[PDB]
Amino acid sequence: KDDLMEALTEYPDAKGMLEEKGKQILMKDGLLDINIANPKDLEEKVTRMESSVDLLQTRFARILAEYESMQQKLKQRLTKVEKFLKPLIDT
Amino acid sequence: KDDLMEALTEYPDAKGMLEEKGKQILMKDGLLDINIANAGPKDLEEKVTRMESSVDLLQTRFARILAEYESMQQKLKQRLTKVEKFLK
Amino acid sequence: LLQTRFARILAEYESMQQKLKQRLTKVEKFL
Amino acid sequence: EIREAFRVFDKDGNGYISAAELRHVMTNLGEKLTDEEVDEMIREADIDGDGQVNYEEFVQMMTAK
Amino acid sequence: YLPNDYVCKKGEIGREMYIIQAGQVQVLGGPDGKSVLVTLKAGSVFGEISLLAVGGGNRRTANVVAHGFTNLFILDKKDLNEILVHYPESQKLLRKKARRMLRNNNKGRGGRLALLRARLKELAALEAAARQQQLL
């Protein structure tokens, strides 16, 4: 089987024709197991997951920047309050 | 061909030079190596793998950011409690 | 799931920031 | 981007950003409004006059052309 | 290697890693070349920094010439890659060492900061335009 696959690596449509006529041969007597056994949706979902991840990261970057700015402002206010209280604490 | 690509693993610029020279040769003589065939399932698989890697990286970054935010909030709460205790 | 977690974390961070800002404003008004 | 900017500037998450909180929105955001200028910007954006900029007020200020 | 044989040439890929087991080799440097800077003897390795490099990224620095009949032990980078395929816990350490050596020469948080800065610049352009419109 491996030799057949690796010889078919250089032949793209030969494998398709071979499998089509193998399906035909099976259909001649005992057609496969499920006749409704019959791709792009998987690739579309794979791409949509990456797009959603990228959008979430883009939103989270701005969210983190805003949170950092707010934390800096709050830290500055707390430091000012602590410095104001410092005169009473040391004295 | 495998030998040629094995000899080009250490010369990435030479690979591009060879491909460009071949493309100009084909354009000069041949079917001009028609560029309307494609631009970029292998591509879909590569895009899916890149999206999965980006999702994993984003999840790790989100976890790190959440841990850092929790640590910062705990430190701020401790500082506020200490300031209140010092005032009181 | 990541989007839902991000939304929940944003809401929790907003609530915590509101509590901290209220406490800081009360402290500043007192002093 | 408007919601993210409002959340970053409005660290309180209560739908209103005060004049002081605008300082926390200074580094997070890309606008210059602090001290007397911050108070003037709040008055211009705060049509109601309560001293704080709401989500609707912030959206109107951002989309005001 | 025969006497006066260029083991390593200047401006070459230098992918391998040679060790000396019998003989001596000399690094031909100097102002205009053809000048010995240092000679290594049995038990000395050189070129190991290239084993952690990438395709065509380790252009040799100088010339190395065998003084006489030298006996070297070559270990090619391709063999190292094949061996590394089966060892990820050593591969991560080797890549960390390579990253350290590449970082010590030049000098998601960053991307998020860049996106936030771009959004802030876009908002600031609009704020300046609104201020001008209020003035005008």
User: How many Cβ pairs within 8 Å bridge chains A and C?
Assistant: 25
Q: Which residues of C touch B58 (CB under 8 A)?
A: 2
Q: Which residues of B touch E (CB under 8 A)?
A: 9-13, 57-58, 60-61
CB D62 within 8 A of CB D45: no
The CA-based angle A18-A22-A27, given to 5 degrees, is: 150
Contact B73 C16 (CB under 8 A): yes
Separation CA E78–CA B6 (nearest Å): 10
Chains that touch E (3 or more CB pairs under 8 A): A, B, D
- The structural domains of chain D, with segments of one domain joined by +, span 1-62
Q: What is the CA radius of gyration of chain C?
A: 13
Give the 3-state secondary structure of chain C.
Answer: CHHHHHHHHHHHHHHHHHHHHHHHHHHHHHC
Chains that touch D (3 or more CB pairs under 8 A): A, C, E
Judged by DSSP in three states, A44 sits in: helix
What DSSP character marks residue E83? H
Neighbours of A46 (CB within 10 A): 19
Which two tokens mark E99?
A: 């990253």
CB D57 within 8 A of CB D5: no
- CA-nearest residue to B62 within chain C is C6
> What is D1-62's CATH topology?
Recoverin; domain 1 (1.10.238)
The CA-based angle D7-A81-B81, given to 5 degrees, is: 80
Judged by DSSP in three states, E27 sits in: strand
Burial code (b: 16+ CB inside 10 Å, e: under 16) for B42-76 equals eeeeebbeebeebbeebbebbeebeeebeeebeeb
Q: What is the CA radius of gyration of chain B?
A: 28
Judged by DSSP in three states, E66 sits in: strand
Q: CA torsion angle for B48, B50, B52, B56 (degrees, to 10)?
A: -170
Give the 3-state secondary structure of E119-132.
Answer: HHHHHHHHHHHHHH
Instruction: Give this entry's resolution in angstroms.
Output: 2.8
CB D8 within 8 A of CB D29: yes
Burial of A52 (0-12, 13-18, 19+ CB in 10 A): middle
Matching residue, tokens 């705990």 = B74
Contact E55 B57 (CB under 8 A): no
Experimental method: cryo-EM
The CA-based angle B39-B42-B48, given to 5 degrees, is: 100
Residue C19 sits at the chain B interface (C-beta within 8 Å): no
Separation CA C1–CA B3 (nearest Å): 47
